[PDB]
mmCIF file of C-alpha atoms in Angstrom:
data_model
loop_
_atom_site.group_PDB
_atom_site.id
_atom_site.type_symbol
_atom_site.label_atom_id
_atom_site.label_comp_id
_atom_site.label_asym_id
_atom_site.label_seq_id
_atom_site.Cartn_x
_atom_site.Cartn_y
_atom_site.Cartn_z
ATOM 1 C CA UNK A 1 97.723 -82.003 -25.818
ATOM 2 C CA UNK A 2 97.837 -85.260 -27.600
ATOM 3 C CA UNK A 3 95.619 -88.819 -26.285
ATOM 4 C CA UNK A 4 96.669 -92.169 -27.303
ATOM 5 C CA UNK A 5 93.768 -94.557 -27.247
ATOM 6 C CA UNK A 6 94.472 -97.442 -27.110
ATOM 7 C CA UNK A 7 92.240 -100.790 -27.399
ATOM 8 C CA UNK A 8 93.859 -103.799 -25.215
ATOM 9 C CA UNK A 9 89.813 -105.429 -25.207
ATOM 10 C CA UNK A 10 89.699 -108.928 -27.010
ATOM 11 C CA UNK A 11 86.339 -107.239 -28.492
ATOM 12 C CA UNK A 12 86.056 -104.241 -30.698
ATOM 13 C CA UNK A 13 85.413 -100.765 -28.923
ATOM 14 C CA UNK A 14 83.635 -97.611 -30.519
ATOM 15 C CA UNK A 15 85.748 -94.930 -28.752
ATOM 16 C CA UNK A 16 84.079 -91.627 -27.612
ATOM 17 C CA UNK A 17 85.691 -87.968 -27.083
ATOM 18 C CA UNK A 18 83.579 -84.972 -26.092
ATOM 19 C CA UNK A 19 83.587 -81.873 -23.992
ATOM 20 C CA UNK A 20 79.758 -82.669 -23.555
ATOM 21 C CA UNK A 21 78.522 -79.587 -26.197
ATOM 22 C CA UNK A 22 81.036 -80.326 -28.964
ATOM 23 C CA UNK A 23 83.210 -83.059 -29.834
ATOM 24 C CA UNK A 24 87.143 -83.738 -29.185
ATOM 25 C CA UNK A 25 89.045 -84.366 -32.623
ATOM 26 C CA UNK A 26 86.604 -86.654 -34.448
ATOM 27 C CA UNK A 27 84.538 -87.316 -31.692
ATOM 28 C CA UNK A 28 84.622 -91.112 -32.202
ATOM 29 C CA UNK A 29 86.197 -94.036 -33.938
ATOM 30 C CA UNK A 30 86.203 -97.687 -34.414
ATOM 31 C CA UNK A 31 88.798 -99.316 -32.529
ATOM 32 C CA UNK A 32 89.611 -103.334 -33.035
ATOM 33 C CA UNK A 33 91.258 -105.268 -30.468
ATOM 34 C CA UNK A 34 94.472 -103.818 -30.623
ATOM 35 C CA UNK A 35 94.076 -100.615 -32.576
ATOM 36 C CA UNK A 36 95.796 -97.073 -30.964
ATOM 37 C CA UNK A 37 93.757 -93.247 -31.881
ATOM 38 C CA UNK A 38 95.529 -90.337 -31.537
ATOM 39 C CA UNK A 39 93.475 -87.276 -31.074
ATOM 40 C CA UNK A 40 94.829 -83.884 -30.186
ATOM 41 C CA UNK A 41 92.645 -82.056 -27.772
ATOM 42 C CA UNK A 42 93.131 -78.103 -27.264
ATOM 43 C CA UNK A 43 94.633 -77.005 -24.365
ATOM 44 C CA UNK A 44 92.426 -75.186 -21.840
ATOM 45 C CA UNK A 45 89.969 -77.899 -22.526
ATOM 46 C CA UNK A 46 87.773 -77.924 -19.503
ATOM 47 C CA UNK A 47 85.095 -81.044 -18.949
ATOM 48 C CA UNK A 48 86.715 -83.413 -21.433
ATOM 49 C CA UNK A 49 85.802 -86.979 -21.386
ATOM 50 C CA UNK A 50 86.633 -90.147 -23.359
ATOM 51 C CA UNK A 51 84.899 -93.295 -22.881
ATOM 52 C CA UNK A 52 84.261 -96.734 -25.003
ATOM 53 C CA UNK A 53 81.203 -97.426 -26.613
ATOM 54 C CA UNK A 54 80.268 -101.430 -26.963
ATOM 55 C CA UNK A 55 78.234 -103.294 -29.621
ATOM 56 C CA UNK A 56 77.912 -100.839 -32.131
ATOM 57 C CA UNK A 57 75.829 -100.815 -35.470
ATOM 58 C CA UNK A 58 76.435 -97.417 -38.185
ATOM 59 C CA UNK A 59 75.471 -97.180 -41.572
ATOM 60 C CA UNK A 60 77.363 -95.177 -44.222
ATOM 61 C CA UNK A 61 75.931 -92.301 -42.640
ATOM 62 C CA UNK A 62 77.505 -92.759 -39.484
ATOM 63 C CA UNK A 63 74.362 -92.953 -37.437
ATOM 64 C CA UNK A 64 73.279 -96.513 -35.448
ATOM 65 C CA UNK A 65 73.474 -97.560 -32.098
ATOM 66 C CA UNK A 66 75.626 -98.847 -28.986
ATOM 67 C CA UNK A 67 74.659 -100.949 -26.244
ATOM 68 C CA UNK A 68 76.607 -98.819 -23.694
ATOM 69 C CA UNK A 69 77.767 -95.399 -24.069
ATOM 70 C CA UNK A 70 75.332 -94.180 -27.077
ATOM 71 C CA UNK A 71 75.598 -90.288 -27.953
ATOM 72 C CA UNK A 72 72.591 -89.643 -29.779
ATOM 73 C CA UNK A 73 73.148 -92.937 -32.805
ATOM 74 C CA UNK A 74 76.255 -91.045 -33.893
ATOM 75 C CA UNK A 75 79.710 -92.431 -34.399
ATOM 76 C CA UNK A 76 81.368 -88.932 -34.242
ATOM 77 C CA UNK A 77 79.912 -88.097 -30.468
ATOM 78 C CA UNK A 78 78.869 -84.240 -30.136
ATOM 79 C CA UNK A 79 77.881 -84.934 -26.218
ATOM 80 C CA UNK A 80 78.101 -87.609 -23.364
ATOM 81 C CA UNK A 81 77.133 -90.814 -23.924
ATOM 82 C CA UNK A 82 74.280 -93.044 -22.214
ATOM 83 C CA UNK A 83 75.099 -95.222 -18.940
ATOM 84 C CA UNK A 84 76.582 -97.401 -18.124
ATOM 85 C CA UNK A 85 79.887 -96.016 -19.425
ATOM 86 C CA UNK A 86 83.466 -95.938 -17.405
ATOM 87 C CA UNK A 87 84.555 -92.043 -17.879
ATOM 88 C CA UNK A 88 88.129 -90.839 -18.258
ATOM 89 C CA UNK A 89 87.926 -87.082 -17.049
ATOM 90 C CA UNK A 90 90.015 -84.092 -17.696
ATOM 91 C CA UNK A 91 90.603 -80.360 -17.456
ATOM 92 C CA UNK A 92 93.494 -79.337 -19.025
ATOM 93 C CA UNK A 93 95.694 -75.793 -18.441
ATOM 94 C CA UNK A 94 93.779 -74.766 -15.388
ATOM 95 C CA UNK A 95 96.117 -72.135 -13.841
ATOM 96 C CA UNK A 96 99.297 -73.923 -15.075
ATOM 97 C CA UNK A 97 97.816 -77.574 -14.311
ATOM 98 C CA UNK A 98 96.271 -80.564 -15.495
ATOM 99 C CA UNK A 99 93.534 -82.376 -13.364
ATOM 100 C CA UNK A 100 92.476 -86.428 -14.506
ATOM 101 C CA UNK A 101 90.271 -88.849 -12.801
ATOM 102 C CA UNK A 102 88.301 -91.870 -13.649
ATOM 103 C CA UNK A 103 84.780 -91.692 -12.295
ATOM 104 C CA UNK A 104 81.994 -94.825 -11.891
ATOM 105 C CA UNK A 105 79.507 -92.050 -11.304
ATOM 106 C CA UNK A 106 78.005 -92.552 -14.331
ATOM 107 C CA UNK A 107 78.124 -96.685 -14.116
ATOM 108 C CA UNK A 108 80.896 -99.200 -15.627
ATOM 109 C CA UNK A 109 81.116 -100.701 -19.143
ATOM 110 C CA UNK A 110 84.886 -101.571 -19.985
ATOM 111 C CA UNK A 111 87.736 -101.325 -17.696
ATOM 112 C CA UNK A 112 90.294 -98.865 -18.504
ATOM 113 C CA UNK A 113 93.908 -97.436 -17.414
ATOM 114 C CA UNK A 114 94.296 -93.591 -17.631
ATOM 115 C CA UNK A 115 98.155 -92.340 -17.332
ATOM 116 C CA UNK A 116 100.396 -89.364 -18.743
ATOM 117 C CA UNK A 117 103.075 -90.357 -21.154
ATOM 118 C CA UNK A 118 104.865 -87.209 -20.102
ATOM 119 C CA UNK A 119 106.640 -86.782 -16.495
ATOM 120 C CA UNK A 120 105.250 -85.635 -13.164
ATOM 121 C CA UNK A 121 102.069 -87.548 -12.008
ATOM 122 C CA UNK A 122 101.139 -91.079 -11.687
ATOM 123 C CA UNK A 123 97.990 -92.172 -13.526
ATOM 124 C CA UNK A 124 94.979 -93.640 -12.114
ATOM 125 C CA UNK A 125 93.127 -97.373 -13.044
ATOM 126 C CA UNK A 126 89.792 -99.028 -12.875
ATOM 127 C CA UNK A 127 90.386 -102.635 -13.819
ATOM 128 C CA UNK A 128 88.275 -104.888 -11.980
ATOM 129 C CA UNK A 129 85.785 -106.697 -12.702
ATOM 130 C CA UNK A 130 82.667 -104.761 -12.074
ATOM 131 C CA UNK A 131 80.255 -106.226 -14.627
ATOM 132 C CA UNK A 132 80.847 -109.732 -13.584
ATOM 133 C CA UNK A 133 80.679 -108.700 -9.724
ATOM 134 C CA UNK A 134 77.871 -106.106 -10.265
ATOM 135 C CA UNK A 135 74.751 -106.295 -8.115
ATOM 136 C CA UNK A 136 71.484 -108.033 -9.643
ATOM 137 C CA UNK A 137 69.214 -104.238 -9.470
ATOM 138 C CA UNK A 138 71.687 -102.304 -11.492
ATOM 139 C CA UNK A 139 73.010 -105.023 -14.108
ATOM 140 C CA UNK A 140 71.845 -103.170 -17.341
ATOM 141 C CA UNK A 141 70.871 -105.951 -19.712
ATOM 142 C CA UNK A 142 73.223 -104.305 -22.776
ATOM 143 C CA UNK A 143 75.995 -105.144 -20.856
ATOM 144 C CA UNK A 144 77.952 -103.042 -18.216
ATOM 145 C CA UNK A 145 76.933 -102.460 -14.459
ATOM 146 C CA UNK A 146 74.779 -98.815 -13.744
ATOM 147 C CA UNK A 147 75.213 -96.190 -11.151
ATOM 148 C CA UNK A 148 72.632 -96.077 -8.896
ATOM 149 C CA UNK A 149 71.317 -92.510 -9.570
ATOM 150 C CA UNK A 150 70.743 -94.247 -13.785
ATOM 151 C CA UNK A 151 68.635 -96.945 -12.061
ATOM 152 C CA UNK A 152 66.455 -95.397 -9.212
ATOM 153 C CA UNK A 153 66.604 -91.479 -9.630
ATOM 154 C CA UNK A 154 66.374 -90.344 -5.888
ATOM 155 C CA UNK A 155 68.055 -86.927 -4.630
ATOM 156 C CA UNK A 156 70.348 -89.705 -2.385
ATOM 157 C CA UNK A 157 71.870 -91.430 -5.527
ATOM 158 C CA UNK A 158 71.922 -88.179 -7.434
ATOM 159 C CA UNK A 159 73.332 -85.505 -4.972
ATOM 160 C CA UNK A 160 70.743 -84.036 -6.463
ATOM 161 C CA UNK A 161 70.493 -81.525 -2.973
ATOM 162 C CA UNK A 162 74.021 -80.836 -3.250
ATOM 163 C CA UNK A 163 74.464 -83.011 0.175
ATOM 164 C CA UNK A 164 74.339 -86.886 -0.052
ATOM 165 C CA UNK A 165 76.496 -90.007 1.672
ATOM 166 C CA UNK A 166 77.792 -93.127 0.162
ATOM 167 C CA UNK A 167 75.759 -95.915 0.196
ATOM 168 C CA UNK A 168 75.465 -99.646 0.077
ATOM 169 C CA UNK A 169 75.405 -98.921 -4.075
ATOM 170 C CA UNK A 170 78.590 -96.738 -4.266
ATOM 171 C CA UNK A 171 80.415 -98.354 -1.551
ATOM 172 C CA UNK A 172 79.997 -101.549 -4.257
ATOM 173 C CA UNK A 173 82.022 -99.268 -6.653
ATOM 174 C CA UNK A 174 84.479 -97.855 -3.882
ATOM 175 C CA UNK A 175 85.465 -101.563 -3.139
ATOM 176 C CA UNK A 176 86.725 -102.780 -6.292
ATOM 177 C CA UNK A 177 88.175 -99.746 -7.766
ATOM 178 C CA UNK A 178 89.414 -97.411 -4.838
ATOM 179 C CA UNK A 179 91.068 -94.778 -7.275
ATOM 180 C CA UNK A 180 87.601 -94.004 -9.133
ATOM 181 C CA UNK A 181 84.877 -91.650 -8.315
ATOM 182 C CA UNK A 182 81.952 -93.432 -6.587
ATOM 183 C CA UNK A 183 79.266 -91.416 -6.172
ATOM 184 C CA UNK A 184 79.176 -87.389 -6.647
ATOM 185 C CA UNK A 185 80.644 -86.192 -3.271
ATOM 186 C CA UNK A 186 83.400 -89.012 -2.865
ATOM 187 C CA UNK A 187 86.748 -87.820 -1.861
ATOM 188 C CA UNK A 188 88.277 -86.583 -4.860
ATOM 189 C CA UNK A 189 90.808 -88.983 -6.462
ATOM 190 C CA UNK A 190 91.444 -86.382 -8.708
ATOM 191 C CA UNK A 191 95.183 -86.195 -9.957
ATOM 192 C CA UNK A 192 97.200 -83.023 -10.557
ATOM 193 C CA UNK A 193 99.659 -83.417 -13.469
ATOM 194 C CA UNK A 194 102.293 -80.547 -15.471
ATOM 195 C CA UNK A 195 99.982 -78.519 -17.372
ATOM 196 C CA UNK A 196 100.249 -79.767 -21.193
ATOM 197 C CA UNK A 197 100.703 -83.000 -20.187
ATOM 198 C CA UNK A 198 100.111 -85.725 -22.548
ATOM 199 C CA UNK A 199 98.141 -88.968 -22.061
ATOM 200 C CA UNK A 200 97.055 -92.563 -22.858
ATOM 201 C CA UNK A 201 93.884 -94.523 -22.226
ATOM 202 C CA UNK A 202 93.930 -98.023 -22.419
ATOM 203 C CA UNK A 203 90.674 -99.491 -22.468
ATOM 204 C CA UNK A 204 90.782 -103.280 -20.972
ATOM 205 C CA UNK A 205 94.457 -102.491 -19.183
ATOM 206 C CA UNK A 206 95.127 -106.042 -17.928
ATOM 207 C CA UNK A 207 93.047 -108.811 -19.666
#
């Protein structure tokens, strides 16, 4: 399957791909405001995310930091990156589908469209404003708003028991972007697409 990435941000994004123990394509790229990455990801790829990194340093080597979304001081990410990051999600071929979401379980950094550029499913968006609107406890001072489970590590925030409710942290979430995961257990906004589809995030869909 093929990804266009595309940067609509007025700032420069460090774009992410991994499948959490290896990375998609390159793994990572500089994108300025404007720029579009095409990566191919294999099909059957189960667990793939792709996410944008903000206020990035790298050497020659490749290795630095990000503000939001570091994976280990690389720019080619190997794994996930550090919260507060917006996550575009994917399985792809599972039994003749395709299954996409966006999730806020992990926290909010940039907002970001995810949609097919093939036929058959709609795509899903996260666009509001969360960082401006985000509550004072998780505001992470890099920038970006964090999940509650990042900030205060209880077995509530976490699911960590395997049962858990929303709460006054994830509801915050739930209200501005409806089609996103919340917290771990939300009600699946997952969307089923043609298996093989092919796809485009836009990070920063709107403004």
């Amino acid at each position: 399957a093929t990804f266009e990435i595309v940067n609509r941000c007025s700032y420069t994004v460090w774009a992410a791909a991994s499948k959490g123990d290896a990375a998609l394509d390159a793994g990572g790229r500089q994108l300025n405001s404007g720029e579009s990455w095409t990566i191919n990801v294999e099909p059957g790829t189960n667990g793939g995310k792709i996410w944008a990194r903000t206020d990035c340093y790298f050497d020659d080597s490749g290795s630095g930091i990000c503000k939001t979304g570091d994976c280990g001081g690389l720019l080619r990410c190997k794994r996930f990156g550090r919260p507060p990051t917006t996550l575009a999600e994917f399985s792809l071929n599972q039994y003749g589908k395709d299954y996409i979401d966006i999730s806020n379980i992990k926290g909010f950094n940039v907002p970001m469209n995810f949609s097919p550029t093939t036929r058959g499913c709609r795509g899903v968006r996260c666009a509001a404003d969360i960082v401006g609107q985000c509550p004072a406890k998780l505001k992470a001072p890099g920038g970006g708003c964090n999940d509650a489970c990042t900030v205060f590590q209880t077995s509530e925030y976490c699911c960590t028991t395997g049962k858990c409710g929303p709460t006054e942290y994830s509801r915050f979430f739930k209200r501005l972007c409806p089609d996103a995961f919340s917290y771990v257990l939300d009600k699946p906004t997952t969307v089923t697409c043609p298996g093989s589809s092919n796809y485009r995030v836009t990070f920063c869909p709107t403004a």
